[PDB]
Structure formats: C-alpha cells, structure tokens
C-alpha cells in the first residue's frame, strides 16, 4: 500500500486502485503500473523534476527507508500476474534493495522530492514506477 498526494491529485499503483480511484479517474496507464484519480482535499507531496539516479524509497515489509541508486526509467520485463500479464512494463526504475509483496506503493524520494513509487521487486532487487514526467500533476 502507499500513495502520492499532489495538489488535487492522488498517484496510486493501477494494480492497487480503489472503486473511488476508478470512479475519479483521471488517467491511467496499465504499462506503467499508474493510476491517477481526483481528490477534493489540496494535498502537499512536491513532486521532483529531475533526472536523480540516487534517492531514499520506503520499504513497508522492513519499516524501514533505504538510500538506493537506481538507473533511468526504461522497458523493463514484467512476470504474471493476477493483476498483470507477461509484458514489459515502461518507465520503470530498478535498484539494489529489499522489496517483497507489500511493499508496492513505498515513495522513492529524492533531494528535489517525490521520484516515485515501488511497482516491482524480488532477486533482492526493487522497480520504481517513475512519475517525474507527468508534468501536469502540478498545473
Ligand atoms: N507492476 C507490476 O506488474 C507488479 C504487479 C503486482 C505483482 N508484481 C510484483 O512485482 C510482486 N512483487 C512486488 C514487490 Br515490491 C516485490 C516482489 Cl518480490 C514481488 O514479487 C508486479
Ligand atoms: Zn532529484
């Protein structure tokens, strides 16, 4: 679980997202493992416009942050699923780090902010959905 709340927005795992999520949708993106839906409360998470390959992610299943470097948003080969099928999942950042079931939503924060949130993971590996681009959750 875990989400980024920017502005009147809320950035959320699409595998993970709510009726209300679904119901508020803005966009989504099945590639990326994204969902963006609408909030009626301001939130204040800053978003990073940046191109960091070093950040601090949250992992859930230690109650722990750790500082990772991590390499540039790509194509990245993505197993089954009962959410998913075999594809390659794009935007997605991966790093050496402890990640296990349950830790999908943990912020990847960087020193100009919110980088993104942990997608995938396993093989003592963890793959962040990258949300840097999206330009328009601050207008
Ligand atoms: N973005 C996706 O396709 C994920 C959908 C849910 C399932 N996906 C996973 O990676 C499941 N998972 C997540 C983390 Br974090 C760590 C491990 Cl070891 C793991 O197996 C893939
Ligand atoms: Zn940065």
Redesign the pocket.
């Known amino acids: 679980s875990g989400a980024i709340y920017v502005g009147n927005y809320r950035v959320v795992?699409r595998?993970l997202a709510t009726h209300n999520d679904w119901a508020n949708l803005v966009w989504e993106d099945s590639s990326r493992?994204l969902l963006v839906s609408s909030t009626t409360a301001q939130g204040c998470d800053t978003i990073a416009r940046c191109d960091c390959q070093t950040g601090v992610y949250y992992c859930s299943s230690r109650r722990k942050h750790y500082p990772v470097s991590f390499s540039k948003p790509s194509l990245i080969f993505?197993?089954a699923?009962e959410?998913?099928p075999a594809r390659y999942?794009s935007h997605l950042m991966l790093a050496v780090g402890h990640?296990?079931?349950?830790?999908?939503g943990g912020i990847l924060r960087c020193q100009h902010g919110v980088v993104g949130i942990?997608?995938?993971?396993?093989?003592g590996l963890?793959?962040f959905?990258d949300v840097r681009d999206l330009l328009w959750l601050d207008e």
Do not use: L, R, W
């Open positions: 795992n595998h493992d993505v197993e699923s959410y998913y999942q990640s296990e079931p349950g830790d999908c942990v997608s995938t993971g396993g093989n963890v793959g959905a």
